[PDB]
């Protein structure tokens, strides 16, 4: 039961289901103490069973209990666990993650196969703690708190922090992904080249494995944090290291379109 | 029906009222039992509606006040041809009511809204998914507090063990409680004026080291 931005309150439906259950339980106890006839006690016990069923798995038996003035069934525990919106598929087999971004992609013909164009501001936000550490190592900031307070305002950003960010991302790689992720090559590892502008630059040869074109497609970027994750990405997930299809064994990163035309 | 309680709940509370009526009925008055029963049944039903219909429970008298406010606002909207102002409702309520009181009463009467309220025409998003968590500290805040503790220890190491311990004991960094000057003096065996003097000189050394290194300034927010 939480107070939102404007001081209003928002609460779970489990609270209303529990209130139903407790009201009916206390009323049953009071009816038993006062020696009610068997018809009243029977109705109350049946309502108590209905309330327990509503709490555990609403809509399972009988009409689903709804909030007043609403046809929306209350969300029970079973509804929380199962379904595409259920706990398993939404918060266990897949999560929203930190150190990730998203932007519109652009063809980067000048890129090498192991490279991708990454906007400056996206990289500044993605590697922000590494950039704070590098700004503390160099004389750009007294400590990490001052470096963050400096990065907070965009007009306080000077040009030395861009060189520091260049130093931070050295050797490291990022993960590019495009939905739908139909096979394991929907995510690939690329060395990032910092670029001005707000677009991600993608190598042409991998556009077939991502099924990506440039009619408005967007991609997501992720930063592997550990030395272990970085090694996994650079060795096993690097774009230049996966040149053949795991399905057919044939080449996947192969000439196409303009390249074939010119040759 | 339609007051916040299901039909069967109203039936059961009315049965409670009927039990009360059976226990209080006097047949000598020659009144049929339905007469005396109806009063108790309506009483129990209205009491239950007033007691249980709200997630945030509100006392019965305040519920009566809010319902009277609603009825008055509806009368004013039927006579004015538009929704009334706070001041017009305060006028129609009589003495003791101003616009501020009407506003505060309407604010108190606000019921909460479901976290699972749908967003969009697809079943894919909920309202509570757009609600942040303001209680648990962010990683930035925890890192900042840790760095503050570490810089505090770095600055206290530039004192002697005794004059840093005096400050640690007086400001609560040790044991969590702030000791009085008498207690720190009795712990170091010295006089309370003596411990106050060494506390002041330790604070002086800390202020000097701060003006020199400018380390703890950024943590002032």
């Amino acid at each position: 039961m939480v107070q939102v931005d404007g001081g209003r309150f928002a609460t779970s439906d489990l609270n209303d289901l529990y209130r139903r259950l407790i009201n009916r339980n206390n009323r049953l106890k009071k009816l038993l103490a006062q020696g009610a006839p068997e018809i009243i006690i029977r109705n109350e016990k049946r309502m108590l069973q209905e309330a327990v069923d509503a709490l555990l798995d609403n809509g399972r038996r009988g009409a689903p209990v709804t909030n007043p003035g609403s046809d929306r069934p209350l969300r029970s525990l079973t509804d929380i666990l199962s379904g595409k919106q259920g706990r398993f598929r939404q918060n266990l087999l897949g999560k929203r993650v930190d150190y990730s971004g998203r932007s519109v992609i652009v063809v980067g013909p000048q890129l090498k196969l192991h490279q991708c164009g990454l906007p400056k501001r996206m990289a500044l936000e993605l590697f922000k703690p590494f950039l704070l550490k590098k700004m503390e190592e160099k004389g750009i900031a007294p400590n990490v708190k001052a470096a963050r307070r400096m990065l907070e305002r965009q007009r306080d950003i000077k040009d030395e922090v861009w060189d520091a960010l260049e130093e931070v991302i050295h050797g490291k790689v990022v993960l590019l992904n495009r939905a739908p992720t139909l096979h394991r090559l929907g995510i690939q590892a690329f060395q990032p080249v910092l670029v001005e502008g707000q677009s991600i630059q993608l190598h042409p040869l991998v556009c077939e494995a991502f099924n990506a074109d440039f009619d408005g497609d967007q991609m997501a970027v992720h930063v592997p944090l550990s030395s272990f994750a970085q090694a996994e990405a650079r060795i096993q997930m690097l774009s230049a290291h996966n040149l053949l299809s795991p399905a057919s064994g044939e080449p996947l990163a192969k000439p196409s379109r303009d390249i074939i035309l010119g040759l | 029906t339609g007051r916040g309680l299901s039909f069967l709940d109203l039936i059961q509370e009315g049965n409670q009222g009927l039990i009360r009526a059976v226990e209080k009925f006097e047949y000598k008055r020659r009144f049929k039992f339905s007469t005396y029963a109806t009063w108790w049944i309506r009483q129990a039903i209205n009491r239950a509606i007033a007691d249980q219909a709200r997630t945030i429970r509100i006392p019965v008298h305040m519920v009566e006040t809010i319902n009277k406010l609603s009825r008055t606002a509806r009368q004013l909207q039927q006579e004015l041809g538009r929704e009334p102002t706070y001041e017009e409702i305060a006028e129609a309520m009589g003495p003791g009511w101003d616009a501020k009181r009407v506003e505060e009463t309407l604010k108190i009467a606000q019921e909460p809204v479901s976290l699972e309220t749908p967003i969009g025409d697809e079943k894919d998003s909920f309202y509570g998914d757009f609600i942040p968590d303001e209680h648990l500290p962010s990683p930035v805040d925890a890192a900042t507090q840790s760095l503050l503790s570490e810089e505090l220890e770095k600055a206290l190491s530039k004192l002697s063990e005794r004059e840093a311990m005096v400050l640690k004991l007086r400001k609560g960094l040790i044991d969590g409680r702030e000791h009085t000057l008498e207690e720190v003096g009795a712990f170091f065996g010295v006089t309370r004026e003596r411990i106050r003097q060494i506390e002041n000189k330790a604070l002086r050394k800390l202020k000097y080291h701060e003006s020199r290194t400018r380390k703890l300034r950024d943590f002032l927010d």
């Binding site: 018809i39 029977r42 109705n43 049946r46 309502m47 009988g62 | 069967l8 039936i11």
Partner: peptide, 14 residues
């Protein structure tokens, strides 16, 4: 299956 119909049937037996 309808609790209210069942309760009304039970009420109608007295």
């Amino acid at each position: 299956s309808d609790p209210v119909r069942q309760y009304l049937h039970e009420i109608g037996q007295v």
